[PDB]
Design a protein around this ligand. Structure first.
Ligand code: HEM
Ligand code: HEM
Ligand code: HEM
Ligand code: HEM
Ligand code: HEM
Ligand code: HEM
Ligand code: HEM
Ligand code: HEM
Ligand code: HEM
Ligand code: HEM
Ligand code: HEM
Ligand code: HEM
Ligand SMILES: [Zn+2]
Ligand SMILES: [Zn+2]
Ligand SMILES: [Zn+2]
Ligand SMILES: [Zn+2]
Ligand SMILES: [Zn+2]
Ligand SMILES: [Zn+2]
Ligand SMILES: [Zn+2]
Ligand SMILES: [Zn+2]
Ligand SMILES: [Zn+2]
Ligand SMILES: [Zn+2]
Ligand SMILES: [Zn+2]
Ligand SMILES: [Zn+2]
Ligand SMILES: [Zn+2]
Ligand SMILES: [Zn+2]
Ligand SMILES: [Zn+2]
Ligand SMILES: [Zn+2]
Ligand SMILES: [Zn+2]
Ligand SMILES: [Zn+2]
Ligand SMILES: [Zn+2]
Ligand SMILES: [Zn+2]
Ligand SMILES: [Zn+2]
Ligand SMILES: [Zn+2]
Ligand SMILES: [Zn+2]
Ligand SMILES: [Zn+2]
Ligand SMILES: [Zn+2]
Ligand SMILES: [Zn+2]
Ligand SMILES: [Zn+2]
Ligand SMILES: [Zn+2]
Ligand SMILES: [Zn+2]
Ligand SMILES: [Zn+2]
Ligand SMILES: [Zn+2]
Ligand SMILES: [Zn+2]
Ligand SMILES: [Zn+2]
Ligand SMILES: [Zn+2]
Ligand SMILES: [Zn+2]
Ligand SMILES: [Zn+2]
Lengths: 106, 106, 106, 106, 106, 106, 106, 106, 106, 106, 106, 106
């Protein structure tokens, strides 16, 4: 999938978690998010197509996905323990990271 | 995934198919559509909530999904054979199936 | 398994569902129902032996089982989400299909 | 495989079953036939490209494959149980369905 | 599955073996029985909750299942070798063990 | 893993069970216990090093592990059915098995 | 495999172990011994045919094999750790079980 | 396994096939023989260590195994088809190849 | 499959290759050819029945199939690289082997 | 597993390596450590429950596990080469990292 | 494999991509590179054998492989979309990273 | 992988074998050699491009690879048995096979 598609996936599954009333539904959504973010991690966005792999921007872009994957895994861990509310709140904290990266690079 | 979720997967992948520049992306999209449709197959839409599983409406709902799965498997056959423009055209024609069910039941 | 055997599987596992107090028990019983139903789909019931595979009675018989597999997956979806009383509710609805087919063909 | 290819699989394995003198030969041949019919179900024959996918013709065409698959599974079931002559006799009855569909859409 | 459920599996498959006319039917039925007995071995019957897990009663109760499993494997071994009447005769001898345990702890 | 190692796994997981707030943690713990006990089953404790594999002491050592595996499979059945308090209570009662072997052979 | 066949497997592989100069050879021979022993466990030896499956002779026979599988795993544990002379040593000890059972029942 | 070991597998399973009274016994025995011959093909017998790997002797030696494997597959094919007496007769013809090679290089 | 069946597989799939316009179709047909050829390798053709498995005619027959499997893999290698016209070219070359063997033995 | 449990796992397996006399035992222990550290990597310790995912502390916490995983993989690599002493010394170097993180965050 | 070998692998597959005329060949080569780099990531080169795991050099060494793996995954993504030229150009950009690390540490 | 590529794999792994200090490295190397040789088996070298697949030269080319695969499987047998010096010596003797084909066809 390409970057735009990984984002759609990230976005839609954020909304699935927000409306979810059960752990499995949260778990499924976080699994999809984890896969979408790992794919995206190696992507180069349009605004950075002229930048070299070792630029500060790239670094920063790759760091933001590694940060996102960390958090998804943490919420996924809570989801697996049946802790819906806590998983949802962890998901909600994720938005901070989506937005920070969007400000710089979207 | 619920009915809305499956519908979102179907529509999202339709767009991926439409903008694709290669077979793998098309095959991937249709593979996800097949999965979503197979799941949606056994669902009850809001407007048929009061109907019996053995009703004309529910027979009709379920046959729409069987029809769609059929057309997706056909399109997937083409993507697999690397036939992008053709898989794309088959996707466009599936939309008649999407629309027909919607008109009756959305 | 023969027709009688499959019926005995559908019937026991439906009792299992009826008295379960947990998702795993419902998940597992519904899975055994799907296989029994998928087997029975191809059978020829005593009362319809004098009949051709293209008769309206055999279309009816065969399609009784599609509708059953439909409702089984619906209930399995709810079971997978930990929703015991809702999977039980949806398992209750299967009986309308069991009853309709028995009325005409048992 | 295209329609023609599945048909060759179908015909070719019908003959294998006719000359077969052991259960295994019949099992494999009926297993190849099942997969060829399954794939074939999603196809559109030349005589029906002009037709809409909802049309009476397409419904009747695809029903023809699910009825063949039904009979194939029954035959297979018999062969799993080692009953070679009975699987062969049920394979002969399959010809009805072959010829019915050929008479209409071939 | 609880104790009662395994027993239903045990009894239900005993009957299948009695009316069976082919090796495969016997194989599967004896395979289901093995798994039901295996699961059953760890259970505590109502008549023995008062008892300590080391007690003579529990030892004799659990030994009853390993002896049944033994006979089940012997029967199965015969069925793998296609000897249908001999598997059926060994299945009849199983009744000894069924009734011995029922006489003491059921 | 050696005997000490297996014993450490058993004790550690006992504590995890005791402090758990969810089924997945309990199921996981017992799954590890089952593995450790299955391994320890075939070991020779320090104080029986001079005894024969066919001795009353070694019969007795090995039957303790068979008994424990039995109780763990029972408890695991409960954790699987999401029954936390009950799986916890079954775990506490296993301790009688731990103690009895220890008194004789540690 | 029948009783004679399984015995021939136990005997050859024990020679293999005896003359191996490497873990892999011992690992592999012990694995083949476990399966042969797991098969033989359900057999009825010529000398105990006139006997009921619940006799003390058949409890004895059956339990001869539990003890064998026990000692086999002990030696497999050492083999898995690359400890050739220690796995060979532990394989030497199996013979006490072979000998005891042969004394009473061969 | 060394050459001697494969030979023991070969010989040992030849006898199993001679006394076999069911297809399964023959299948497994011929399957073990195939793997033993396959492994054996790469070995160098004592009588030929002095020889170059291109020599007439090594070519003829290794050809002897591919010819045995050929006959083994033919026998196996017959056994898969349940024809027990015919598999046994083809196994008897295998002796030709056994003895031809033994006469030259054993 | 018997010799006739395998030949029918080689022949149909070679036509499939000849008229494919895509790698997947060629990949899949060549895979079915390898299995048919691997089966036929052990057969005995009518004309060589009066012959011993060590005759020059049977060495010739058997080695016809090694050479075929050789050329099949060559073409599968090109197919796997998406090279349709080159896999087709290499599939054309197989026929020299088909022809040579038919000249001497069909 | 939660953080406290991953640590127990880390700790116990450190002691297994220290007393290990064979590569397999070291390998098993490092595999368990690798899994415990990857789980822990996404955890938030008690002392940092008020800190945001992008705090310097979190960063630092995640960096310490990535450093630990690096080292475990390096020792695991040595263990796989049969280099016990070297693996043990690599394990011992690990303690530097455990302790550094404990000073700040435990 | 050790560091020197991972490098050979990296080097050879760089040359395979440079001469490749098809996506599969590129894909295969990048898969081999990805695996070689992940192995290498945990290695310690000769020039840094005296340095502690947390030295700036080690950090820097591990960062260079993580950067390389990122890029390989990006080229692998393009290769999977059938984009040969683009994959090759991404591979060529990789050399910047190989060389930078070689200047410091080789 | 093409012929050159396979040859590079063969030579590279030969060197790994020659400099190895442990079994796992040797086993790994030979495993890669086996794969490369199995692939090269079905290739046509530059200097035989104008020859038929049924030519003495192509028979001869292919038999060289069968011979090499044979010797590699023998050497691999030794590495598996942890026999480093011996696997090394078997590798050195394979070089005669490499050279003989080269002299004729490189
Ligand atoms: C779960 C968190 C995230 C969500 C919900 C999210 C959502 C989205 C959405 C809806 C879009 C618009 C896609 C489109 O239709 O074109 C987008 C685009 C984008 N996002 Fe994210 N995003 C997330 C995380 C991130 C992160 C962590 C980064 C960088 C580290 C990032 C970088 C970008 C970029 C560069 C685009 C523009 C892509 C293009 O123009 O091709 N996103 N995101
Ligand atoms: C590729 C074909 C299809 C596409 C792209 C598609 C797309 C959509 C979309 C975008 C929605 C909006 C739902 C929401 O998020 O609120 C929707 C809803 C819906 N669709 Fe589809 N659909 C397709 C096929 C079908 C078929 C075949 C059926 C009937 C058998 C169907 C039945 C419905 C129904 C009943 C709703 C209402 C959902 C609700 O309000 O809960 N769709 N669809
Ligand atoms: C989940 C729903 C169902 C349940 C619980 C159920 C249960 C049963 C039971 C307990 C029997 C008696 C078995 C015996 O002969 O000893 C039976 C018989 C039978 N059922 Fe069902 N059934 C179900 C669905 C169906 C459906 C959907 C059909 C038709 C499409 C059907 C057709 C029949 C027929 C033809 C028999 C008599 C066969 C004979 O004489 O052996 N059943 N069923
Ligand atoms: C097992 C039973 C069947 C057999 C043995 C069989 C056999 C065949 C054969 C030998 C052909 C000629 C293929 C060729 O032109 O190379 C064919 C074509 C065809 N068959 Fe069947 N068939 C069977 C079942 C069916 C069924 C059930 C249907 C419809 C539901 C069907 C529809 C067709 C169609 C539409 C063609 C024409 C394809 C074309 O012209 O491209 N067949 N079949
Ligand atoms: C294959 C032989 C066996 C058969 C056919 C069989 C069958 C049955 C049946 C039909 C029931 C009534 C279940 C119900 O109340 O719904 C039952 C209950 C029971 N059986 Fe068996 N059984 C067998 C072997 C055994 C063995 C070997 C033991 C003990 C070692 C055993 C112990 C029990 C117990 C304790 C109950 C009572 C469970 C309860 O009341 O909840 N059974 N069995
Ligand atoms: C869940 C139940 C059990 C728990 C929690 C448990 C726990 C322990 C613990 C913490 C140790 C200390 C060993 C050390 O690290 O030095 C130990 C040792 C030991 N346990 Fe257990 N155990 C259990 C079950 C059993 C059973 C069923 C047996 C006998 C069949 C057994 C036999 C022994 C023996 C012989 C030792 C001495 C080990 C040595 O000194 O080498 N344990 N156990
Ligand atoms: C690893 C240990 C064992 C070895 C090496 C071994 C070996 C053998 C051998 C070589 C034979 C002669 C086979 C023939 O009839 O041609 C034999 C027979 C026999 N063994 Fe074992 N055995 C072992 C364990 C056991 C055990 C544990 C038992 C009982 C629990 C047992 C019971 C028997 C019986 C009953 C026979 C005679 C069966 C007949 O007449 O066909 N063996 N054994
Ligand atoms: C299925 C047919 C065969 C049977 C039943 C068979 C059986 C045997 C037996 C029982 C031995 C004595 C093993 C020992 O010393 O412990 C042996 C040794 C041997 N066999 Fe075979 N064999 C067969 C096929 C072959 C073939 C086809 C070849 C050559 C192509 C061959 C070559 C040898 C060699 C070279 C030895 C001597 C090994 C040594 O001394 O270390 N055998 N075989
Ligand atoms: C890919 C290449 C090949 C193709 C396309 C092919 C095709 C065929 C066909 C269509 C038949 C007639 C089937 C029938 O009896 O109804 C046949 C027969 C036969 N072929 Fe092949 N073949 C091939 C390779 C070979 C090879 C390599 C050999 C020998 C090494 C061989 C030996 C035979 C024999 C002996 C028969 C007659 C068997 C009988 O009477 O039933 N074929 N072949
Ligand atoms: C192999 C290296 C390590 C070992 C052997 C080890 C061992 C331990 C042990 C025994 C505990 C006490 C657990 C308890 O009973 O509550 C602990 C706790 C802890 N460790 Fe580690 N540890 C290691 C690595 C690390 C690393 C790398 C970090 C941070 C990057 C870390 C952070 C912590 C924290 C935050 C706690 C307190 C957890 C709590 O209170 O819930 N540890 N460790
Ligand atoms: C795809 C990119 C790379 C290529 C093509 C490549 C190629 C090579 C080659 C051919 C060698 C000589 C190996 C020998 O025969 O001894 C080598 C060595 C080396 N490379 Fe790389 N390399 C790459 C990436 C890297 C990276 C990213 C690093 C560090 C982050 C690195 C660090 C080293 C080191 C330290 C050595 C010396 C190893 C020793 O002496 O044992 N290389 N590389
Ligand atoms: C372990 C044994 C072998 C090794 C180490 C080896 C090594 C090599 C090497 C390093 C090359 C240089 C190719 C290049 O990159 O341009 C080569 C080429 C070649 N080898 Fe081998 N080889 C071995 C076995 C064989 C065998 C058994 C054959 C024949 C059946 C063979 C046939 C060839 C041919 C024909 C070439 C020329 C490739 C070309 O110019 O395209 N090799 N080999
Ligand atoms: Zn992607
Ligand atoms: Zn960087
Ligand atoms: Zn910038
Ligand atoms: Zn769903
Ligand atoms: Zn969307
Ligand atoms: Zn209906
Ligand atoms: Zn059935
Ligand atoms: Zn009909
Ligand atoms: Zn197809
Ligand atoms: Zn046509
Ligand atoms: Zn055909
Ligand atoms: Zn329709
Ligand atoms: Zn259960
Ligand atoms: Zn009750
Ligand atoms: Zn029942
Ligand atoms: Zn006890
Ligand atoms: Zn262990
Ligand atoms: Zn511990
Ligand atoms: Zn004993
Ligand atoms: Zn057996
Ligand atoms: Zn008893
Ligand atoms: Zn071997
Ligand atoms: Zn000797
Ligand atoms: Zn033997
Ligand atoms: Zn040669
Ligand atoms: Zn065949
Ligand atoms: Zn010959
Ligand atoms: Zn965890
Ligand atoms: Zn950060
Ligand atoms: Zn702080
Ligand atoms: Zn490595
Ligand atoms: Zn650091
Ligand atoms: Zn420095
Ligand atoms: Zn290749
Ligand atoms: Zn190289
Ligand atoms: Zn030739």
């Amino acid at each position: 999938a390409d970057l735009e598609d990984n984002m759609e996936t990230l976005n839609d599954n954020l909304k699935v978690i927000e409306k979810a009333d059960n752990a499995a539904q949260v778990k499924d959504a976080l699994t999809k998010m984890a896969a979408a973010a790992a794919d995206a991690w190696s992507a180069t966005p349009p605004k950075l197509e002229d930048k070299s792999p070792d630029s500060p921007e790239m670094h920063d872009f790759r760091h933001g996905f590694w940060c996102l994957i960390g958090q998804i895994h943490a919420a996924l861990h809570l989801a697996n323990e049946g802790k819906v509310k806590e998983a949802q709140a962890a998901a909600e904290q994720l938005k901070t990271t989506c937005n920070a990266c969007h400000q710089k690079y979207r």
